Design a protein around this ligand. Structure first.
Ligand SMILES: [Zn+2]
Length: 364
């Protein structure tokens, strides 16, 4: 009872830089908050699709290869997969994610965005911990238990402990696509679009693994050196160097603004509000914040005051454009910044930025 293409208007436009396979650009933004969640207010459990998209980044490859099935590894609640389902309404999916008590091993976001799970032909159900671990041979051995389609495009958004774990996955992918009866029959025109953290320089990829392009996303945490690398089979080359990623990341932060989503998913905004502060309603106005202050009259009451104080600061703050120059102003105009980051945890602060972004967009 849901049209996927209609749901796509809840996802924001993606700004990125492609580096196909020199002075330094530096700007020290005094920011302590995860501002990359500013345009992600319409999403609850996972929001990767606000940062990366197959139609925007690898649109041509999607058209040229025309895959019937897509293979997703490492997705939490499957928000990237959810965006893909909206962009490509006839594509079926194979989902894998580590069976942990830590992050989601089920696509909650996909179930929320897309109506049902009928297009997820393999959800990884019944599998053990090692058969869901991309750094283990058995995961790759059982990837074809339902889908008999070759791994034309494999999407990996897994967070690895170290680069050696990343190499374990990349080597296992190569070993699969060069052994597997299904995949070998298709050929060597097979791809792996994986998340990577460019820490070093001149780091060779495994034998017969070649990087086609590097993608630097506006939606990646400003502090790190995260990027998305498009790999294929062929004479090996180097992984992206930390220096290249920095200049690219900087230009996007200094030049570009975050696009807001064309439509506001009021159900999710209400959900993110109640998740941040129980009983918080929309519109978030002076009357709403004074009501929340009144309800308080402990550790939980301390966190609630911290939240209201920030929302009150955003409320009183002038309207600006969604960019890091304005975000730095927002932070360095608030007297209790250090008290905020100390009292609220990482998840609470990401929820706070989602709510903040909704408010900033709602202005004027
Ligand atoms: Zn295969």
């Amino acid at each position: 009872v849901i049209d996927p293409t209609e749901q796509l208007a809840y996802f924001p436009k993606i700004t990125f830089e492609r580096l196909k396979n020199k002075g330094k650009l530096t700007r020290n933004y005094m920011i302590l908050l995860p501002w990359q969640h500013v345009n992600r207010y319409n999403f609850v459990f996972s929001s990767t699709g606000c940062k990366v998209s197959l139609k925007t980044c690898i649109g041509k490859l999607m058209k040229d290869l025309n895959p019937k099935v897509l293979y997703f590894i490492g997705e939490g609640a499957g928000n990237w997969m959810a965006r893909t389902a909206c962009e490509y309404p006839d594509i079926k999916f194979v989902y894998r994610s580590l069976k942990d008590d830590l992050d989601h091993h089920y696509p909650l976001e996909y179930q929320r965005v897309i109506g049902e799970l009928s297009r997820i032909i393999d959800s990884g159900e019944g599998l053990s911990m090692e058969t869901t671990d991309a750094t283990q041979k058995t995961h790759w051995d059982l990837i074809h238990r339902v889908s008999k389609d070759a791994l034309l495009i494999t999407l990996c958004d897994a967070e690895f402990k170290d680069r050696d774990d990343f190499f374990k996955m990349v080597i296992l992918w190569r070993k699969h696509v060069l052994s597997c009866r299904i995949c070998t029959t298709y050929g060597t025109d097979l791809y792996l679009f994986a998340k990577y953290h460019a820490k070093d320089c001149n780091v060779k990829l495994p034998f017969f693994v070649r990087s086609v392009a590097t993608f630097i996303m506006q939606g990646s945490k400003l502090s790190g050196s995260e990027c998305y690398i498009l790999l294929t089979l062929g004479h090996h080359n180097n992984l992206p160097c930390h220096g290249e990623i920095q200049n690219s990341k900087m230009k996007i932060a200094v030049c570009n603004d975050f696009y807001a989503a064309k439509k506001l998913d009021n159900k999710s905004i209400e959900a993110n509000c109640k998740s941040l502060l129980s009983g918080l309603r929309i519109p978030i106005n002076k009357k709403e914040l004074n009501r929340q202050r009144r309800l308080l009259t402990k550790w939980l009451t301390n966190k609630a005051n911290t939240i209201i104080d920030w929302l009150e600061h955003i409320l009183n703050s002038p309207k600006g454009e969604l960019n890091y120059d304005f975000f730095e102003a927002l932070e360095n105009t608030y007297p209790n910044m250090i008290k905020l980051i100390d009292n609220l945890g990482n998840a609470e602060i990401k929820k706070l930025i989602k709510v903040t972004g909704y408010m900033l967009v709602s202005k004027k």
